[PDB]
Amino acid sequence: AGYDRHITIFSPEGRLYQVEYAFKATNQTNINSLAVRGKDCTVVISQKKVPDKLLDPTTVSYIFCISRTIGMVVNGPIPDARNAALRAKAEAAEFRYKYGYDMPCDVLAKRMANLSQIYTQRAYMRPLGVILTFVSVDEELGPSIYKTDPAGYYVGYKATATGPKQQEITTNLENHFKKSKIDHINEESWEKVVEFAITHMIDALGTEFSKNDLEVGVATKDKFFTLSAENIEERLVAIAEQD
Amino acid sequence: FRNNYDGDTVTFSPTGRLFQVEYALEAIKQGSVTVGLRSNTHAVLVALKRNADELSSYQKKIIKCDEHMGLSLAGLAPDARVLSNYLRQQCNYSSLVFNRKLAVERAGHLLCDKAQKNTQSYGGRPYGVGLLIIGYDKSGAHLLEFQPSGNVTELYGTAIGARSQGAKTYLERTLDTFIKIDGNPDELIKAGVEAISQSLRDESLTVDNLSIAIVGKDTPFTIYDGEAVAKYI
Amino acid sequence: QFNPYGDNGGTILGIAGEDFAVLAGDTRNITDYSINSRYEPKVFDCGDNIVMSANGFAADGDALVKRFKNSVKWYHFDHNDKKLSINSAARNIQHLLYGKRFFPYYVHTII
Amino acid sequence: MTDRYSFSLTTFSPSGKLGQIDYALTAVKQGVTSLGIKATNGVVIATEKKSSSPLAMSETLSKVSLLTPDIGAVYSGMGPDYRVLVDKSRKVAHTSYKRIYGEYPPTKLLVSEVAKIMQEATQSGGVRPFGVSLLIAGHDEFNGFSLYQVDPSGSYFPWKATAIGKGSVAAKTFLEKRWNDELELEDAIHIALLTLKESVEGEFNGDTIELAIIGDENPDLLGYTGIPTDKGPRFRKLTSQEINDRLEAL
Amino acid sequence: DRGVSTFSPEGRLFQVEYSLEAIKLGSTAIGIATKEGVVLGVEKRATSPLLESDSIEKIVEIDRHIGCAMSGLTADARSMIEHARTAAVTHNLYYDEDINVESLTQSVCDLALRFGEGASGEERLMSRPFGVALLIAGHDADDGYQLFHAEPSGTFYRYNAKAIGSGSEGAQAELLNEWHSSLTLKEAELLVLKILKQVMEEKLDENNAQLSCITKQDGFKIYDNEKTAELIKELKEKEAAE
Amino acid sequence: MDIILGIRVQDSVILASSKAVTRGISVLKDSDDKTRQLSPHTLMSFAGEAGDTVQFAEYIQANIQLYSIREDYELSPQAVSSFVRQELAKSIRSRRPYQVNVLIGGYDKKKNKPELYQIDYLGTKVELPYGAHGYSGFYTFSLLDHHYRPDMTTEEGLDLLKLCVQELEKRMPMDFKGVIVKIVDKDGIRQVDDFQAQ
Amino acid sequence: GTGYDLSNSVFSPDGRNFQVEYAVKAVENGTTSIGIKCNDGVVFAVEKLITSKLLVPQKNVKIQVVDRHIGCVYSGLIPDGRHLVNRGREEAASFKKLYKTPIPIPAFADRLGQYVQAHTLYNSVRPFGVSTIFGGVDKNGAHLYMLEPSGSYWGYKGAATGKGRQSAKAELEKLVDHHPEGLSAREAVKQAAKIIYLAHEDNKEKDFELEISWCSLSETNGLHKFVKGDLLQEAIDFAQKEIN
Amino acid sequence: GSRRYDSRTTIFSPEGRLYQVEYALESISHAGTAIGIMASDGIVLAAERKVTSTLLEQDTSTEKLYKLNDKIAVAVAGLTADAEILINTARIHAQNYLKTYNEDIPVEILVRRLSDIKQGYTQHGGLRPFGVSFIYAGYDDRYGYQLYTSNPSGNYTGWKAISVGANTSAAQTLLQMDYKDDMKVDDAIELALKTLSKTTDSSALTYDRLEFATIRKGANDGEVYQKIFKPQEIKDILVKTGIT
Amino acid sequence: GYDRALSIFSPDGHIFQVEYALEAVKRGTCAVGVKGKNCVVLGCERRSTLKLQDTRITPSKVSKIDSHVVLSFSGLNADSRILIEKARVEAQSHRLTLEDPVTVEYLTRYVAGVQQRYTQSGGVRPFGVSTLIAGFDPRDDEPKLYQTEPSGIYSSWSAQTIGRNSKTVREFLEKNYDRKEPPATVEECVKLTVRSLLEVVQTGAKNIEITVVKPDSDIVALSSEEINQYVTQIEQEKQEQ
Instruction: Name the residue of chain B whose CA is nearest to E33's CA.
Output: B55
Residue H142 corresponds to which amino acid?
R
Kindly state whether H53 is in contact with chain A, defined as any CB-CB distance less than 8 angstroms.
Answer: no
Please tell me the distance from the alpha carbon of residue C49 to that of residue B217, in angstroms, as a whole number: 25
Please list the residues that pair with D76 across neighbouring strands.
Answer: D133
Interface mutation target, options E74, E117, E128, chain I, most CBs of I under 10 Å: E128
DSSP state of I132: E
Buried b (16+ CB within 10 A) or exposed e, A194-224: bbbbbbbbeebbeeebebeebbbbbbbeeeb
Q: Give the CATH number of the domain where residue I193 resides.
A: 3.60.20.10
Contact check, Cβ <8 Å, G169/A54: yes
Hey, is A161 helix, strand or coil? Answer: strand
Please tell me the distance from the alpha carbon of residue B63 to that of residue B215, in angstroms, as a whole number: 12
Among residues G65, G74, G147, G50, the alpha carbon closest in space to that of G102 is found at G65
**What's chain E look like in SS3?**
CCCCCCECCCCCEHHHHHHHHHHCCCCCEEEEEECCEEEEEEECCCCCCCECHHHCCCEEEEECCEEEEEEECHHHHHHHHHHHHHHHHHHHHHHCCCCCHHHHHHHHHCCCCCCECCCCCCCCCECCCCCEEEEEEEEECCCEEEEEEECCCCCEEEECEEEECCCHHHHHHHHHHHCCCCCCHHHHHHHHHHHHHHHCCCCCCCCCEEEEEEECCCEEEECCHHHHHHHHHHHHHHHHCC
φ, ψ of residue B45 to 5 degrees: the values are: -110, 130
Q: Where are the domains of chain A?
A: 1-243
Of B109, B116, B172, the CB nearest to G80: B116
CATH class of A1-243: alpha beta
**What's I1-24 look like in SS3?**
CCCCCCCCECCCCCEHHHHHHHHH
List Cα–Cα distances, D21 to A66, D123, D127, H64, in angstroms.
39, 11, 12, 21
Please tell me the distance from the alpha carbon of residue D55 to that of residue A174, in angstroms, as a whole number: 7
Q: How many residues does chain F have?
A: 198
Please list the residues that pair with G187 across neighbouring strands.
Answer: none
Instruction: Name the residue of chain D whose CA is nearest to G123's CA.
Output: D1
Buried b (16+ CB within 10 A) or exposed e, H118-142: bbebbbbbbbbbbbbbbbbbbbbee
Among residues F64, F67, F99, the alpha carbon closest in space to that of F84 is found at F64
Chains H and A touch (3+ CB pairs under 8 A): yes
Among residues A1, B139, B110, the alpha carbon closest in space to that of D19 is found at A1
- Contact residues on chain H for F83, CB-CB shorter than 8 A: 100-101
Specify the fold of G1-244: Glutamine Phosphoribosylpyrophosphate, subunit 1, domain 1 (3.60.20)
Please tell me the distance from the alpha carbon of residue I69 to that of residue I105, in angstroms, as a whole number: 10
Breaks in chain D (C to N > 2.5 A) come right after none
Q: Identify the domain containing residue I190 by its residue range.
A: 1-241
Instruction: Name the residue of chain G whose CA is nearest to B142's CA.
Output: G56
Are E138 and E66 contacting, i.e. CB atoms less than 8 angstroms apart?
Answer: yes
CATH class of B1-233: alpha beta
Please list the residues that pair with A156 across neighbouring strands.
Answer: A146, D57
CA–CA min distance D129, chain I (Å): 20
> DSSP per residue over I183-237, as a string?
--SHHHHHHHHHHHHHHHH-S-SSSEEEEEEETTTEEEEPPHHHHHHHHHHHHHH
Cβ neighbours, 10 Å, residue H32: 24
Hey, is A39 helix, strand or coil? Answer: coil
Among residues D9, B4, A17, the alpha carbon closest in space to that of G5 is found at B4
**What's chain H look like in SS3?**
CCHHHCCCCCCECCCCCEHHHHHHHHHHCCCCCEEEEECCCEEEEEEECCCCCCCECCCCCCCCEEECCCCEEEEEEECHHHHHHHHHHHHHHHHHHHHHHCCCCCHHHHHHHHHHHHHHHHHECCCCCCCEEEEEEEEECCCEEEEEEECCCCCEEEECEEEECCCHHHHHHHHHHHCCCCCCHHHHHHHHHHHHHHHCCCCCCCHHHEEEEEEECCCCCCCCEEEECCHHHHHHHHHHCCCC
Kindly state whether B60 is in contact with chain C, defined as any CB-CB distance less than 8 angstroms.
Answer: no
Cβ neighbours, 10 Å, residue I206: 12
Instruction: Name the residue of chain B whose CA is nearest to G28's CA.
Output: B16
Positive or negative, the CA dihedral G65, G71, G72, G73 is positive
Hey, is A107 helix, strand or coil? Answer: helix
Contacts of A169 (CB under 8 A, 6+ apart): A32, A34, A161, A163, A200, A201, A204, A205
User: Given the DSSP bridges, would you call strands B129-137 and B69-75 parallel, antiparallel or unpaired?
Assistant: antiparallel
Q: Which helix (H) or strand (E) holds G232?
A: helix G229-242
Please tell me the distance from the alpha carbon of residue H211 to that of residue F146, in angstroms, as a whole number: 62
Interface of E with B (CB under 8 A): 2-3, 5-13, 109, 112-113, 116-121, 149, 153-155, 157-162, 172, 175-176, 179
List Cα–Cα distances, F5 to B155, F27, F144, F173, I80, in angstroms.
88, 21, 11, 17, 45
Q: Where are the domains of chain H?
A: 1-244
Contacts of A81 (CB under 8 A, 6+ apart): A62, A64, A74, A130
Interface mutation target, options H100, H140, H141, H142, chain F, most CBs of F under 10 Å: H100
Are B68 and B218 contacting, i.e. CB atoms less than 8 angstroms apart?
Answer: no
List Cα–Cα distances, F170 to F31, F174, F194, in angstroms.
20, 10, 20
Contacts of C87 (CB under 8 A, 6+ apart): E96, E97
Please tell me the distance from the alpha carbon of residue E128 to that of residue E115, in angstroms, as a whole number: 6
Please tell me the distance from the alpha carbon of residue C89 to that of residue D94, in angstroms, as a whole number: 65
CA–CA min distance B211, chain G (Å): 23
- Contact residues on chain H for D124, CB-CB shorter than 8 A: 127
**E-H Cβ pairs (cutoff 8 Å, strict):** 4
Positive or negative, the CA dihedral I72, I73, I76, I82 is negative
List Cα–Cα distances, A125 to E22, F174, H2, in angstroms.
40, 73, 12
Interface of A with G (CB under 8 A): 2, 5-7, 17-18, 21-28, 53-56, 58-60, 77-80, 82-83, 86, 124-127, 129
Give Rg (Cα) of chain B. Answer: 18
End-to-end CA distance of chain I: 65
Residue I214 corresponds to which amino acid?
K
Please tell me the distance from the alpha carbon of residue G129 to that of residue G30, in angstroms, as a whole number: 10
Are B127 and B144 contacting, i.e. CB atoms less than 8 angstroms apart?
Answer: no
Q: Give the CATH number of the domain where residue F44 resides.
A: 3.60.20.10
Interface mutation target, options B19, B25, B32, B57, chain E, most CBs of E under 10 Å: B57
Q: Where are the domains of chain G?
A: 1-244
Contacts of F3 (CB under 8 A, 6+ apart): F16, F17, F18, F47, F132, F134, F136, F168, F176, F179
Residue G89 corresponds to which amino acid?
R
Q: Which H residues 2-61 touch B at CB under 8 Å?
A: 2
User: How is the beta sheet containing C44-45 ordered, strand by strand?
Assistant: C44-45, C51-56, C107-110
List Cα–Cα distances, A138 to A101, A107, A218, in angstroms.
12, 11, 13
Specify the fold of H1-244: Glutamine Phosphoribosylpyrophosphate, subunit 1, domain 1 (3.60.20)
Please tell me the distance from the alpha carbon of residue G132 to that of residue G220, in angstroms, as a whole number: 22
| Rounded to 5°, angle at Cα D127 from D124 and D128 | 115
Among residues B207, B199, B203, the alpha carbon closest in space to that of B227 is found at B207
Contact check, Cβ <8 Å, E94/C95: yes
Please tell me the distance from the alpha carbon of residue D9 to that of residue A7, in angstroms, as a whole number: 10
CATH numbers and ranges of domains, chain E: 1-242 (3.60.20.10)
Are A225 and A66 contacting, i.e. CB atoms less than 8 angstroms apart?
Answer: no
User: Given the DSSP bridges, would you call strands E29-34 and E144-150 parallel, antiparallel or unpaired?
Assistant: unpaired
Hey, is D20 helix, strand or coil? Answer: helix
* Resolution in angstrom units: 3.1
Instruction: Name the residue of chain B whose CA is nearest to G86's CA.
Output: B113
φ, ψ of residue D139 to 5 degrees: the values are: -145, 130
Are F129 and F151 contacting, i.e. CB atoms less than 8 angstroms apart?
Answer: no
Are B79 and B27 contacting, i.e. CB atoms less than 8 angstroms apart?
Answer: no
Residue F17 corresponds to which amino acid?
S
Are F88 and F49 contacting, i.e. CB atoms less than 8 angstroms apart?
Answer: no
CA–CA min distance A27, chain G (Å): 9
HSE-CB of F90 using CA atoms within 13 angstroms: 8
- Contact residues on chain B for C70, CB-CB shorter than 8 A: 92, 96
Cβ neighbours, 10 Å, residue G61: 13
The residues of G carrying an active-site annotation are 31
Interface of D with H (CB under 8 A): 4-18, 38, 108, 112, 115-116, 118-119, 122-126, 143, 146-147, 153-162, 172, 175-176, 179
Q: Where are the domains of chain B?
A: 1-233
Give the method of determination: X-ray
Kindly state whether E102 is in contact with chain C, defined as any CB-CB distance less than 8 angstroms.
Answer: yes
Are D159 and D38 contacting, i.e. CB atoms less than 8 angstroms apart?
Answer: yes
CATH numbers and ranges of domains, chain D: 1-250 (3.60.20.10)
Are H87 and I88 contacting, i.e. CB atoms less than 8 angstroms apart?
Answer: no
